[PDB]
Structures are given as C-alpha cells and as structure tokens.
Scaffold this active site. Structure first.
Site, PDB file in Angstrom:
ATOM      1  N   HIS B 351       0.780  -1.242   0.000  1.00 32.17           N
ATOM      2  CA  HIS B 351       0.000   0.000   0.000  1.00 32.17           C
ATOM      3  C   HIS B 351       0.819   1.304   0.000  1.00 32.17           C
ATOM      4  O   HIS B 351       0.238   2.389   0.009  1.00 32.17           O
ATOM      5  CB  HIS B 351      -0.968   0.013   1.188  1.00 32.17           C
ATOM      6  CG  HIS B 351      -2.001  -1.069   1.147  1.00 32.17           C
ATOM      7  ND1 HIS B 351      -3.222  -0.910   0.528  1.00 32.17           N
ATOM      8  CD2 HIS B 351      -1.995  -2.323   1.654  1.00 32.17           C
ATOM      9  CE1 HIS B 351      -3.926  -2.019   0.657  1.00 32.17           C
ATOM     10  NE2 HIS B 351      -3.203  -2.894   1.334  1.00 32.17           N
ATOM     11  N   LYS B 542      -8.933  13.810   3.895  1.00 32.46           N
ATOM     12  CA  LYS B 542      -8.003  12.681   3.951  1.00 32.46           C
ATOM     13  C   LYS B 542      -7.086  12.924   5.142  1.00 32.46           C
ATOM     14  O   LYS B 542      -6.983  14.055   5.631  1.00 32.46           O
ATOM     15  CB  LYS B 542      -7.170  12.570   2.663  1.00 32.46           C
ATOM     16  CG  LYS B 542      -6.440  13.862   2.240  1.00 32.46           C
ATOM     17  CD  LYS B 542      -5.820  13.735   0.848  1.00 32.46           C
ATOM     18  CE  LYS B 542      -6.879  13.722  -0.259  1.00 32.46           C
ATOM     19  NZ  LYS B 542      -6.680  12.564  -1.189  1.00 32.46           N
ATOM     20  N   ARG B 543      -6.412  11.876   5.605  1.00 32.62           N
ATOM     21  CA  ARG B 543      -5.454  12.027   6.698  1.00 32.62           C
ATOM     22  C   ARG B 543      -4.418  13.113   6.374  1.00 32.62           C
ATOM     23  O   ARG B 543      -4.060  13.315   5.208  1.00 32.62           O
ATOM     24  CB  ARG B 543      -4.763  10.692   6.991  1.00 32.62           C
ATOM     25  CG  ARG B 543      -5.671   9.659   7.654  1.00 32.62           C
ATOM     26  CD  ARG B 543      -6.106  10.095   9.053  1.00 32.62           C
ATOM     27  NE  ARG B 543      -4.992  10.067  10.002  1.00 32.62           N
ATOM     28  CZ  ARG B 543      -4.730   9.055  10.826  1.00 32.62           C
ATOM     29  NH1 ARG B 543      -5.509   7.982  10.844  1.00 32.62           N
ATOM     30  NH2 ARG B 543      -3.688   9.123  11.651  1.00 32.62           N
ATOM     31  N   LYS B 548       0.591  14.256   0.895  1.00 33.00           N
ATOM     32  CA  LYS B 548      -0.740  14.587   0.361  1.00 33.00           C
ATOM     33  C   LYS B 548      -0.881  16.088   0.067  1.00 33.00           C
ATOM     34  O   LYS B 548      -1.843  16.520  -0.574  1.00 33.00           O
ATOM     35  CB  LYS B 548      -1.850  14.097   1.302  1.00 33.00           C
ATOM     36  CG  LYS B 548      -1.970  12.572   1.394  1.00 33.00           C
ATOM     37  CD  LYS B 548      -2.950  12.163   2.501  1.00 33.00           C
ATOM     38  CE  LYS B 548      -3.033  10.650   2.700  1.00 33.00           C
ATOM     39  NZ  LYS B 548      -3.754   9.956   1.569  1.00 33.00           N
ATOM     40  N   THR B 650      -8.468   6.456  -2.670  1.00 33.83           N
ATOM     41  CA  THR B 650      -9.818   5.919  -2.891  1.00 33.83           C
ATOM     42  C   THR B 650     -10.866   7.010  -2.709  1.00 33.83           C
ATOM     43  O   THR B 650     -11.948   6.943  -3.292  1.00 33.83           O
ATOM     44  CB  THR B 650     -10.162   4.737  -1.961  1.00 33.83           C
ATOM     45  OG1 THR B 650      -9.873   5.095  -0.607  1.00 33.83           O
ATOM     46  CG2 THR B 650      -9.369   3.491  -2.343  1.00 33.83           C
ATOM     47  N   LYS B 654     -14.560   8.118  -4.769  1.00 35.34           N
ATOM     48  CA  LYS B 654     -15.811   8.495  -4.099  1.00 35.34           C
ATOM     49  C   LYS B 654     -16.363   9.813  -4.663  1.00 35.34           C
ATOM     50  O   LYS B 654     -17.559   9.922  -4.942  1.00 35.34           O
ATOM     51  CB  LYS B 654     -15.610   8.614  -2.576  1.00 35.34           C
ATOM     52  CG  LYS B 654     -15.149   7.326  -1.866  1.00 35.34           C
ATOM     53  CD  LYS B 654     -14.667   7.602  -0.440  1.00 35.34           C
ATOM     54  CE  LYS B 654     -13.847   6.439   0.135  1.00 35.34           C
ATOM     55  NZ  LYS B 654     -13.384   6.688   1.543  1.00 35.34           N
TER      56      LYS B 654
HETATM   57  O1  LIG Z   1      -4.085   3.992   4.532  1.00 34.71           O
HETATM   58  C1  LIG Z   1      -2.981   3.470   4.348  1.00 34.71           C
HETATM   59  N1  LIG Z   1      -2.193   3.050   5.361  1.00 34.71           N
HETATM   60  C2  LIG Z   1      -2.521   3.166   6.660  1.00 34.71           C
HETATM   61  O2  LIG Z   1      -3.575   3.662   7.063  1.00 34.71           O
HETATM   62  C3  LIG Z   1      -1.499   2.607   7.682  1.00 34.71           C
HETATM   63  C4  LIG Z   1      -1.983   2.179   8.918  1.00 34.71           C
HETATM   64  C5  LIG Z   1      -1.122   1.658   9.890  1.00 34.71           C
HETATM   65  C6  LIG Z   1       0.248   1.561   9.641  1.00 34.71           C
HETATM   66  C7  LIG Z   1       1.083   1.032  10.637  1.00 34.71           C
HETATM   67  C8  LIG Z   1       2.157   0.196  10.307  1.00 34.71           C
HETATM   68  C9  LIG Z   1       2.974  -0.330  11.313  1.00 34.71           C
HETATM   69  C10 LIG Z   1       2.719  -0.030  12.652  1.00 34.71           C
HETATM   70  C11 LIG Z   1       1.645   0.793  12.988  1.00 34.71           C
HETATM   71  C12 LIG Z   1       0.829   1.318  11.987  1.00 34.71           C
HETATM   72  C13 LIG Z   1       0.746   1.986   8.400  1.00 34.71           C
HETATM   73  C14 LIG Z   1      -0.124   2.508   7.427  1.00 34.71           C
HETATM   74  N2  LIG Z   1      -2.509   3.295   3.109  1.00 34.71           N
HETATM   75  C15 LIG Z   1      -3.327   3.722   1.941  1.00 34.71           C
HETATM   76  O3  LIG Z   1      -3.973   2.535   1.402  1.00 34.71           O
HETATM   77  C16 LIG Z   1      -4.968   2.841   0.413  1.00 34.71           C
HETATM   78  C17 LIG Z   1      -5.660   1.526   0.032  1.00 34.71           C
HETATM   79  O4  LIG Z   1      -4.831   0.752  -0.843  1.00 34.71           O
HETATM   80  C18 LIG Z   1      -4.342   3.604  -0.780  1.00 34.71           C
HETATM   81  O5  LIG Z   1      -5.379   4.063  -1.629  1.00 34.71           O
HETATM   82  C19 LIG Z   1      -3.518   4.815  -0.304  1.00 34.71           C
HETATM   83  O6  LIG Z   1      -2.817   5.375  -1.412  1.00 34.71           O
HETATM   84  C20 LIG Z   1      -2.534   4.401   0.813  1.00 34.71           C
HETATM   85  O7  LIG Z   1      -1.803   5.525   1.321  1.00 34.71           O
END
Ligand SMILES: O=C(NC(=O)c1ccc(-c2ccccc2)cc1)N[C@@H]1O[C@H](CO)[C@@H](O)[C@H](O)[C@H]1O
Ligand SMILES: O=C(NC(=O)c1ccc(-c2ccccc2)cc1)N[C@@H]1O[C@H](CO)[C@@H](O)[C@H](O)[C@H]1O
Lengths: 810, 810
Positions: B351, B542-543, B548, B650, B654
C-alpha cells in the site's frame, strides 16, 4: 410432577416452547444442529426473563404513581447465587418450563447447572442482603438494593496437594442474561482534590472523576407480581481521561479497577486504598440517584419521610458524611437541619464484635482521598463530644472512648462510632449479640442514647432455602397443610400435630434419604469420591475462621478414629464427616486448618480397619449453589463457635429448615433456635457467654486440659510427631503452638462436653423413628427464622413502613 | 419516497412496527413514556438485525455443504463506519423501515445519526478492507474478514484553539447490536518462552498464554441473500493468570491490553512491542481457526485448493512463519512441502513506497517475544538467498539487498521481503504504483520472480458510496437506465447518451444543489458555522500527511486571498474551501499544518473586504460518517499528492462517483480516472513521475522558486512575519524552514501550474451547463472503480475462484 412447582397448562407449555425456539434462533444465532447445552441454558434464561419484563415495568410505574416511602439497602456485598430456578419459583413457571424443555428433548436440571453463581459476597453478610431483597419484594416494599458490579466475585477454590489455591471468578465470561445496562443513568464520582473556603461556603475542587454506570437486575416477589430492582454500579473512565497517546488510553484501566474485584478478607481489616475507593464509589453514586429520585416526585424536611437508607455494616458508612456534604455544600442547608435529616434517614446494622474486623481508617488516607469528608467527620465528632460532655460532666475517659477519632501511632476514624452518631437506629443480628453490644463494645453509646439500640434477629428466605433446594420436603409439607406456609412460615407449627403420624414420619425420613442418595451421586459424578449413604451426614460448611472452630470438629474426628483403632471390632454409628469453606487468602492459620482437614482424610479414608465406618471429606469451593445441594442432605449441623463470637449465623437456620438436627453452643441465633424448638430437641454443649468471661478473668491455661485429658494428649502428640504428615513431621507445629499457647477461642475448654454430646447424637441416630420425630419438632418450629419476619420487623420498627402481601395485577 | 430504496408493503410495514415495539419492551425494557432517541435507535437496529439471522445461518450452512474454496482476508484494520443504513440498503428494507418508523411518530434519519461509527481503521487501507467485504458478499464468495476488536478505535478529533486534541473513541460504551460473541470458539495464543530441540523436532515451551475470543459481525451482500462473516478477536486472560491476590486479579489487564486500542500512526513505523503482540495475536488465532475449519471438511496437499489467505499489507506478515511453524512443528510435514503449501496459500498487497512506513522489526524484539518464529525466518532467508545466489552467481550486493535480515546498528527483519518470498502473488493498488514496485523498491525481486507481480487497481463499493450517501443521484440515474448498475457499475456508461439531454443536465445539477444545501445546514446545526451554498465547494478530505500536500492547497488559498485584497472590486468565483482530516498524534509537522489551516481561516473568514467570496473551513473529526455527508456535496475534489507518492487513493473515486470534478496530479489511481473519463474532463497539473526523478537527479532547490515567483515570495514573507499569527510571530517557522530547506515533496515546484489550473476550474464553474456536462462525463465513466471489479480480479487472478451474482433462497 409435584404440586408446589405450579401448573403446566397446554397454552403455557406451547408458548414457552416457541419463545425458546425464537431465542435460540434470533438471540443466540444458532440452530438445533450446532447448539451446545450452554446455548440451551441461555435460550431458557431469556425465555423466563421475558416474563419478568411486564411486571418489572409496571411495578416501577406503580411506585411512581403511589409515591410510597422508598427503602435503600446499601451493601458492598450481594451473594445472589443462581437466578434461573429462583425466578421460575417466584413466577410459578417451574413445572411449565420443565414440561416445555422435556418436549424439546432437554433436561432442565442439566441446563440449570450451567449457570454461574453471582458470587458477589463472602458469606453470611452478603447472603443476608440477598435473602432480604427476596423478602422485601415478597412483602411488597418499594425497596432498592444498591452495590457494586464486581467483574470478579469471590474466588473459585481449588484444592491442590491438600492446599487451597485461588483462581479468579470470571463469572461474566459468557454474559449475564439477567442484568440490563443503563448507561444513560451514568453518574460522576469525585476523588482527591482539595477544599477551598469561600465567602459563601466550602468548595471541593481539582478532583479526579470516575464515572459510575448502573446495571439493573430484577428481584421478583413470591407470586405477587412485584419485581423490585437491584442496581449495581460499574466504574468507567471519562473520555478525556489522561487526555504517549497509547499509554493514556491504557491508563483508563486505573479508574476502572475500582469495580474489578471483591475483597475476600472477611477476617481482618486492612486499610487498603482501593477498598476505600470502592466504599465511597458505591455511596456517592447511590446518594445522587436517591436525591434525583426524591426531587423527581427543594424541601428536604420531608426527605426522611420518603427515604430510608440501611447500612449493611460500616462498609457504606461514608453515606453519613456524604449526605451531610450534599445537604450543606450543595443544597445550602444549615448544619443542624442537615444533621437532623441525616440521622432520621440512616440506620446501621452491626455484624460482629471481633475488634480486628472493625473498620478503622487511617486519617492520612481520608485526608488525601476525601479531604472534605474528613473535615465533616471532625465537625461531627466535636458536636457529638460536646453532647457527651454535657451529659456526663467531668468524665474525661468516656470522651476519649466515644471519640470518632482514635489517637495513637496513626490517627484513625472509627467507622462504627460514626455510624452510631449518624443513625436513628442501631441493631445487632440476634438477641444475644444485640445484648452484648449494649453491655460491652457500644456500652457508652447505649448509656447516652438507649432508644437507638434494637435487635433484629436474622432470617433466611424459605423460597430459595426450602422450595427451590428441597422440593421433596416442600411437597410432603404442602400435602398436609397447604401452600400458604411458603410466604407465612409460622404456619409450619401445624406440623407439630403430625409428630406421631406414622405416614408423615415415613415421608420425612424418605425425603432425607433421597436427598442423601442424590448428593452421594453428585460427589461421585463430579469429584470421584465414594461415600456410604447409610451413614450419618455430619456437616460443617461456612468460611474458615478460628472463632468458628473447625478445629474443634477436627479433634472430634481424630478422637473417633483413635477409638476405632483402639477397639476395631466394637460397633460404632457410621459417619460421613463433611467440612467445607473458603479461607481468606492472607489468613495463614485458616489455610493450615484446610490442610489439616485434608491430611486427616488422607489417613482416615485409607485405613482398612476403619472401612466405611468413618469418612472425612473436604467440600471444595463451598458457595451458594453447593449449599443448595449439601444442606438438604445433612443429618447433623455443626454450629460450634465459641460463645459470644458468632453474631447470628444463618447457615444454622438453613439446616434446621431442611431436616438436620443441630449440635451447637449457646451462641448467636442458636440460642433462639433452641428456645423455639425446645432444649430437649437440640444438642447443646459447652461454655455459655458467662463461663467464657469467668475463664478470661482467671486466665485461660490450655496446658491444664492437655494434662487432665488423656484422649486430648494423644491427639496433640499425634499432630506434633508427624502422624498426619509423615514426610513433613513438623507441618502442623503452628497449629499445636496456637492451641497450647495463644488460643483466643478456647478449643480445649469445650472438648470434653463436645465429645460427650456427640455420643448422645450417635445414640439417637440408632433410633431412626425417634431421630425423625425430633427432626419434625425442629422443622415445625423454624418459622421465626424466615427473613419475611426479619424484614417485617425492620419495616415496622426502623423504616416506618407497612408490609403488604397483596398482589399487583398480572 | 424514492424507487431505489425498495417497497413499503402493507404486510412488511405492519410486521416491522410490531417487532420494533417488541424489542422496545422485551429487549430494552422500556415503554414509550421513558424511551430516549437512543432507545428508539436500538429497537430499530435489533429489528433490522432479526432479518439478517436466517440468511446468516443458511449462508454458513450452504458453505459447509458445498465446501467451496474459502477466502481469508487478514487485516489489522476494518474501517466499517455505521451499519444500520447499509444493512437496510442491502436487504431492500429502507423504505419499509422509513414508513414503519414514520407511523410510530419517528424520524429514521434522526435515529441513524445516533449510531457510533465502527472506527477500526486509520484511513484508506482500513476502508479498502471494508469495501472489499461488501463486494465479496455481493459476488457470492465464501469470504471471511479476520481482525482485532479494538475497544478504542481511531481517536475522536477535537479542535481547541486551532490545535488538534485527541480523545478516546469509546465506541462500545452503549453496546454493539451487530456483533455476536462466540466465547465457545475461544483459542489460546502463545508469547515469549524458549525453543527446545528434541530428537523428534523443535518445541516451543514455557510460554505465556493469552486467550483470543471471537466476535462475529454479519456482512450482507447486495440483495442476494448472502451474509458473510467478519470475525474480530478480543484478548482475554486465562483464569489462572498470575495465579497479592488483589494485584494478581488486577494484572489480568496486561494480557487484555493487546486488543485495547488501534495504533493511529499511519505515517512512520515505530517498533513498539504492543503492536508486535497485536500482529501475532490476530495471525495465531486466525490460522488455528482456518486449520480447524479445513480439517472439519490430514492431507495438507489440498490446503491451497481450499484456502486463500490475503495479507492486507505486511501487518499480518507473521502468517507466513506461523503457518510454517504449525505445518512443521505440529503437523510434522517436511520443510519443502510445508513451504510449497505456504507460498500457494498466501498473497501480499502493498500500500505504499514511502520507506519510513515500511515495517522493519528489530531482531531483539522477535527473539524475546517469538523465538521460534525468528528461527523460521532465518531458515526462510538462507534458503531464499541460496536461490538468489544460484540465479545471479557472484552478485554479492544483490544478496545483501534482497536479504530478509537487514544489517546495521540494530539488526532488523524486512517484513515486505518476507511477504514476497512467502507469497505466490504480490500486487500494488493502482497501475502506476505496481509499475513503480517493479522498477524501484522490489526490482530485485521482480527480476528473480516476475510471475509473482500483479496489479489490482483499488475500488469503492457503490452501495455505501452512492446508494446510501446519495439517494437523490442514485434515483435520477435509475430513472434513465434502471437499477442493475448498483451491482454492475459499468452500466453507468449508458449515461454518456444523456450528456446533451436538457432534463438530465437539470436533474444532475439539482441533486448537487440539494446536497450542498443539506450539508450547509448540517454545518450550522452542529457547528454554528455560516457558508454560502452558491459558492464552489472546494474540498480536500483525507489524513494529514506531507505527501498529500494539504500545504499546497493552503498556498493557493492565501494566493486567492491576496489577489482579492489587491483588487477588491474585481469579480471572483466564490469558494468555500473545506479541508479535513486527522493527524497521527506524534506527527509534529501534520499538527502544525492543521494549526495553519485554522489560522488562515481566522484571517480570511473575518475580513470584511472578502465577504462571502472566500471561506476557509477545517472539517473536524473526519471519519466515514462525515465522508458520507461531505462527498455528495462537493464540486471540486483535491487530489494533489506529489507524483509517485499516493499508491492509489480511494477518496478520489468516491468524489468522481458523486458528481465532483477532480483537480489532481498524475499519481496513483488519478491516472486511470483521467484515462477513463478523458484528460479533457479532468483538471490535471504538475510534475509527472519522470519530472520528479529529473528534479531529484539535479537537486531540488526551493530558493529558486522563491526567487522567481513574486506571489509565492509574498506568502512566505506573510508566514514568517506573523501575518497569520500576530500574537506569536514565529509560530510557523518550522513550516517555512521545511518548505525552504527540506521539502521531500516539492511543494514549490508544482505551485505555478496548480494556481493556473485552479483558474481554469473557476472559469468552467462560471458556465453551469458546461460544468454539469463535464460532471456527467465523469459519473458515466466511473464504473471501473467499483470494488466489485477489483474483487472479481483478485478472485480470478489470485485466489482461483469464480464470482457469482446468483441469489440464495430467502
Ligand atoms: O491507509 C494506508 N495506510 C494506513 O492507514 C497505515 C496504517 C497503519 C500503519 C502502521 C504500520 C505499522 C505499525 C503501525 C501502523 C501503516 C499505514 N494506506 C493507503 O492505502 C490505500 C488503500 O490501498 C491507498 O489508496 C492509499 O494510497 C494508501 O496511502
Ligand atoms: O459475613 C460476615 N462478614 C463478612 O463477610 C465480611 C466481609 C467483608 C469485610 C471487610 C471489611 C473491611 C474491608 C474488607 C472486608 C468484613 C466482614 N459477617 C456475618 O454476618 C452474618 C449476617 O448478619 C452473621 O450471621 C454472622 O454471624 C457474621 O459473622
């Protein structure tokens, strides 16, 4: 099957079966293919619970419309046990449910065994609260039980290598179908902070807040359509709690630890901060609820006319200064008016005279945790002592004896002294106990305010303690005198005219034998132990304490064994001696007593010469559900505390109601039981209170008894030398040392009379007809010890309300 | 009211009303006199839940009988949002419930607002899992979602003094009507201990045990009568835990802390032990459940034929060595056969390419917590590197680059390298992302095993993201082309033949205006903020992350404001600029960005010269339920990440589905969206990936842009001098310093093209008819981005299963 269990109508059975299947499908999300016995239990529980709801809603709306005086029973303990069968009994649903489940291909008794006990109490005090709730509902009183929803109740007891092991009682693991969470009625409780004195009064500021979330449990009356409420508080952190980020969220646990676990130390007061927090938590949340309900009916003059608060021991004693705090600091009433309201509202029940059990809170704890309450306590003390000084001028020692503040190494608040000063009524729990209060520990207080001191002899509910646990006995009684005795236990006196009735004698004895056979089968099925069902069932079940003298019982057991070994081919009445009960985790001597009992059994049960003539069994994990099983099977009830130490006892009453004869000292309610049945129908032995006092004046020397009683000398020598512990010869050295040098409870002094009295028991048991006739005389005179009688006395003499046996519409 | 919401039949409405009243009475224990809106919500929730049960039971029994290949979607996050409306939509119950509640005198929309979001995710990754579950059920796949039941989900965001404050999301406070606890399916999970090597293999011994208790939540398919399961694990201490006594009971909290809270750090990997425990906890419990189900159908050859495990990022990567552990240590399979089974079972989805986000666990943590797994990882590494050495002989640097073990200060395990080695398929989440994986970070792995690497472009469910949140738009579409598009989104292409249809143009524009009016009213009612509904709704939600580029948006806002101040009486297209999103608690720069946004609004919103022409609003507590509100109201979707940084996005999809035009870079799925709609119907600007690479080779010098762009110089001078923070002149010094000296994301480099492109947006908005025609061209070509398409591709190209749109019997 049997009459007292109610009707199994076609309409009802059909309706129960379909509601059962509805709950299995919609509630549990299962079908008959994948359902376990636990699923079947829950489907039944939910089906029965449905019948409570309409009555519960209409009872509470009835109280709103009629606005009667409300009774608030404050307790840190409610020892409820299981709820399913009790609910069926009080709703007259038992036979219908039995039939409905039978047609579904299920055994209801098997399903009943799946329910966890609500073990939210230690023993007698907690169980008394539970019996009281049942009686208050049955007597149509607008009563509320208020306490704490512990996540973990009294520990489950495991015996490993003869030693007690404790494990957490995770009673909520599978969920509780009886409770309803009321998160909308959540209340804040304050801790710590500091007191600010402003122009317009004192203010308690900079506090830490813990939320109190209530859970309501229905308490059904006996077939009167009344359903009262038990409200138990659960601790919750507020959402901005501690609000690196992760730890702040994890730290919410600290706040919620308040309602996590029941303190199991029923022997010795320890000034633990967590316990103090529990005590204030239940009091603060409860009193806000009370005041809110009172307002939803400005003038607090009528407060005592609409509210009674009963304090179950000193544990909720903080209710007194908390009520003063609210009235003075928040409602702006003057001190004297607030005090008048408080006194007329509160009443206090004492449950022991043993000094180590009394709550004496270190001042420094209250100073830190509850700074404003300490200030109020000091002010109460000064005004009270001014009254004492005016009544007994120049009596400086009385002033220090009666003070709420005890001086010394650490300053302490005597919570019992607080309770007496702030209550219009103070009661003991049996006639002899209440007299001892007036003559000894509260003598000074009685001299100042004699009108405050009352007796309210304890009782037990005949619903749980006869109908539920002993349907066979309930039925043979009902055959002769009808069913009205279940809510009017005095009617049992009518059984006196059946004492020479051959049919009744045969039935009473038959019911006991069936009960003994059933319990003997339970012991094999669940514990793989083998007992002779034709032996005398000699049972002592209760918490392990030195004052309760399980040790005296142990000495008798060893005496019997030694006599058998001395004359093996002589006939003796066979006995199964059963001892059970939990020991408080920090009570070393009590844990040694348990080990001793198992150690005796290890020798006795495996001696080929003894055979089936003597068996010693330790009843593991004694609790309400086990009491309901063993009590109906007992022949002999052991109630052998040192005279003046057991405030009342209630186990004694359970055994009397269920057809056991009693061997006991003249202590607690034993005195009144002997009085009701006649001393000829009771096995009384040992020192009376006066004899104990005489021995104390002289000095108790245990060596004297050791020197003059050869049979006792043999036992002590066996204990010391390692006869009962061959691989650890000195294992029981602490027990011998205590007995010989520092026995507060004079075990040796009652030994001879006890053994002698036990011989008289065996003699009677050899005459089955005469044994049973004495039993009938006991059951027939057990009516006084119904908690319906006890509660009617509280209602009339303390709370100022009239009981009613009238039905509410269904 | 509207067609797509289903039928409101006489029979159904009557039945819903009585089941509602039944639940209010029996379930909630209330009557209409004392019921609050929350009680009414719960009664409705329980009524709707009843309709799921039959279908849920029969779906699971169908899978047992037919025994298809099962899909297990492993994720640490499931960002579900609210469940009530979604359930009604998929069951065709919405109009019936609306009518039933209306006749009871209630507003269903008001009741819907009472439900808490299940906020068990951070953002896109967690929301993707949720959309996937909906699509898998709709496509009739035997799929299970497996994760953790966090007690606290993503924090609630409060803005205080312009700063983000975090508060615990206590989402379970009032209970969760959708979940069913399954304490009978509780499983042990092991931690710590040590490895013993015996004659007959390795043994993991002396471990600490935590229990995993499952909670099942129903996942309904769109009107196909399929109901799949999401199973979430909760942590429980075993009953002999730590078993002075009081503390042992309190210490049970330590074990249960595992499932307490979701880690909110989506920006930067921190090697925290508690997170490692969470990751193993979900993996160990899930894999035992999988194997149990597989056996209840000895020969693990058929395991990959019956089981697919999808790893949502590396977070459940421990599934690979855990499966090896079970197969080798417990089932006694040889290494090579176990490895073959593992590889064919597992697939991994990446991701992000940002290196600081990648999980690299310190070896010393795994050594202590999971000693046997470390041993297995080392063995995997050796065998893998032997394959690399054989394929590329003498390439020593490749060997160190591809190693699962990274050398350095602390040794670490690269979890992404583990995932590629142990999976038969590795995918990115958009075409450009997947190409970047093959060309850059996983280049070595692609050269060794090219067949493993795939693309699966992300999608969103049209049920939640059109029908549920935008019924007005769903209905006008359904009027023209029928209802089949809801589960076949490609049918939206039919709308291209309505691009010159005057009635449709008017309807599309009318729906948007109504949506904008509704959202403008929500803002006043809940936040007391006042906006012009005739302005262009410019939204970036978004976050908060540097990549971003919310900061680039901020620079445009200030540019607009400065231009207005320079020429006040010149006409500009009015805008409401809305920015929303949470920042990870430890991400300092992100928290500064939030403060900046609020600080800009403070100046802009109160300048009399500006008037209603420009408004800057920070959308507080952005979450799934807020997305469902703001997205339908948007005119302009901001998707402005630096090219090569947003894997997919994503939110972009939407907005496209709901009638907003997109201003964006050629990054992530934006590329494919522009490709589908046509570049003429998209507002594309800025550097492409190739341009970024060229700038990196040369060196990015931000000073160059500052020197050559006077409008940008003014903004930086305003920021530095305290124009936006008069009382703290240097508040934004960190932001300026980063922009000028260490901007990894080249904000200045895209500034000119962005401002220019924004002028082109305003120009089009002045022509309402042409704006709407471009919108229709976007909606009509949004079909590719349905998660039904994404899941059908996973099913066919990774899992080896065929989707089915066929109904199960009701
Ligand atoms: O939301 C994303 N990641 C997270 O929320 C995330 C959540 C938790 C961690 C995490 C990893 C290790 C320890 C603690 C937390 C790392 C990343 N990634 C997004 O995924 C979407 C679905 O494929 C993509 O559209 C987007 O571009 C991407 O940033
Ligand atoms: O069971 C009793 N007490 C307790 O269980 C008890 C429970 C808890 C505490 C305690 C007090 C302070 C801190 C922590 C625990 C003290 C005592 N008392 C019994 O009450 C019965 C009902 O009136 C009497 O029949 C019985 O004689 C009496 O011992």
């Amino acid at each position: 099957q049997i009459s007292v269990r109610g009707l199994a109508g076609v309409e009802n059975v059909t309706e129960l079966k379909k509601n059962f299947n509805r709950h299995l499908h919609f509630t549990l999300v299962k079908d008959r293919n994948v359902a376990t016995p636990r699923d079947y239990y829950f489907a039944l529980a939910h089906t029965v619970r449905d019948h409570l709801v309409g009555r519960w809603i209409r009872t509470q709306q009835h109280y709103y419309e009629k606005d009667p005086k409300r009774i608030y029973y404050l307790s840190l303990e409610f020892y409820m046990g299981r709820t399913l069968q009790n609910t069926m009994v009080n709703l007259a649903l038992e036979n219908a449910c039995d039939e409905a489940t039978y047609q579904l291909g299920l055994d209801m008794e098997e399903l009943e065994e799946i329910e966890e006990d609500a073990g939210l109490g230690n023993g007698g005090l907690g169980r008394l609260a539970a019996c009281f709730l049942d009686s208050m509902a049955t007597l149509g009183l607008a009563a509320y039980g208020y306490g704490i929803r512990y996540e973990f109740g009294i520990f489950n007891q495991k015996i490993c290598g003869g030693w007690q092991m404790e494990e957490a009682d995770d009673w909520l693991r599978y969920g509780n179908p009886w409770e309803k969470a009321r998160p909308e009625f959540t209340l804040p409780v304050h801790f710590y902070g500091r007191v600010e004195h402003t122009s317009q009064g004192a203010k308690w500021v900079d506090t830490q807040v813990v939320l109190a979330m209530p859970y309501d449990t229905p308490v059904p009356g006996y077939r009167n359509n009344v359903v009262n409420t038990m409200r138990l508080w659960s601790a919750k952190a507020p959402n901005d709690f501690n609000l690196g980020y992760i730890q702040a969220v994890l730290d919410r646990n600290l706040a919620e630890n308040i309602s996590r676990v029941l303190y199991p130390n029923d022997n010795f007061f320890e000034g633990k901060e967590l316990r103090l927090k529990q005590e204030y938590f239940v009091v603060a949340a409860t009193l806000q609820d009370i005041i809110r309900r009172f307002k939803s009916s400005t003038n607090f003059d009528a407060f005592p006319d609409k509210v009674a608060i009963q304090l179950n021991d000193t544990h909720p004693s903080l209710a007194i200064p908390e009520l003063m705090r609210v009235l003075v600091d928040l409602e702006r009433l003057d001190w004297d008016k607030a005090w008048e309201v408080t006194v007329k509202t509160c009443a206090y029940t004492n449950h022991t005279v043993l000094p180590e059990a009394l709550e004496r809170w270190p001042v420094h704890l209250l100073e830190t945790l509850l700074p404003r309450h300490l200030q109020i306590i000091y002010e109460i003390n000064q005004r009270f002592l001014n009254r004492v000084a005016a009544a007994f001028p120049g009596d400086v020692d009385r002033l220090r004896r009666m003070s709420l503040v005890e001086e010394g190494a650490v300053k302490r608040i005597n919570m019992a002294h607080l309770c007496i000063a702030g209550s219009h009524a103070v009661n003991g729990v049996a006639r002899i106990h209440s007299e001892i209060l007036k003559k000894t520990i509260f003598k000074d207080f009685y001299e100042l305010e004699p009108h405050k001191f009352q007796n309210k002899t304890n009782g037990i509910t005949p619903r749980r303690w006869l109908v539920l646990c002993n349907p066979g006995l309930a039925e043979i009684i009902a055959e002769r005198i009808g069913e009205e005795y279940i809510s009017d236990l005095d009617q049992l006196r009518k059984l006196l005219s059946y004492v020479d009735d051959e049919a009744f004698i045969r039935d009473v004895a038959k019911v006991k034998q069936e009960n003994k056979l059933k319990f003997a089968a339970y012991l094999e099925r669940e514990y793989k132990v083998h007992i002779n069902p034709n032996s005398l069932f000699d049972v002592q079940v209760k918490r392990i304490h030195e004052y309760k003298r399980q040790l005296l019982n142990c000495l008798h057991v060893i005496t019997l064994y030694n006599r058998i070994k001395k004359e093996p081919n002589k006939f003796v009445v066979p006995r199964t001696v059963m001892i059970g009960g939990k020991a408080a985790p920090g009570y070393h001597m009590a844990k040694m007593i348990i080990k001793l009992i198992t150690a005796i059994g290890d020798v006795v049960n495996h001696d080929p010469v003894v055979g089936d003539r003597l068996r010693v069994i330790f009843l593991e994990n004694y609790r309400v559900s086990l009491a309901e099983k063993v009590i109906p099977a007992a022949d002999l009830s052991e109630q052998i505390s040192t005279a003046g130490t057991e405030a009342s006892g209630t186990g004694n009453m359970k055994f009397m109601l269920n057809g056991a004869l009693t061997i006991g000292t003249m202590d607690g309610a034993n005195v009144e039981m002997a009085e009701e049945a006649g001393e000829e129908n009771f096995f009384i032995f040992g020192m009376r209170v006066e004899d104990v006092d005489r021995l104390d004046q002289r000095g108790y020397n245990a060596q004297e008894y050791y020197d003059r009683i050869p049979e006792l000398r043999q036992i002590i020598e066996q204990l010391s030398s390692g006869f009962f512990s061959p691989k650890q010869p000195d294992l029981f050295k602490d027990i011998v040392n205590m007995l010989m040098h520092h026995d507060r409870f004079k075990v040796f002094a009652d030994y001879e009379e006890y053994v002698k009295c036990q011989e008289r028991v065996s003699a009677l048991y050899k005459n089955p007809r005469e044994w049973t006739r004495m039993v009938i005389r006991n059951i027939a005179t057990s009516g006084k010890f119904s908690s319906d009688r006890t509660i009617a006395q509280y209602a009339r003499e303390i709370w100022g309300v009239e009981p009613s046996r009238q039905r509410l519409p269904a």
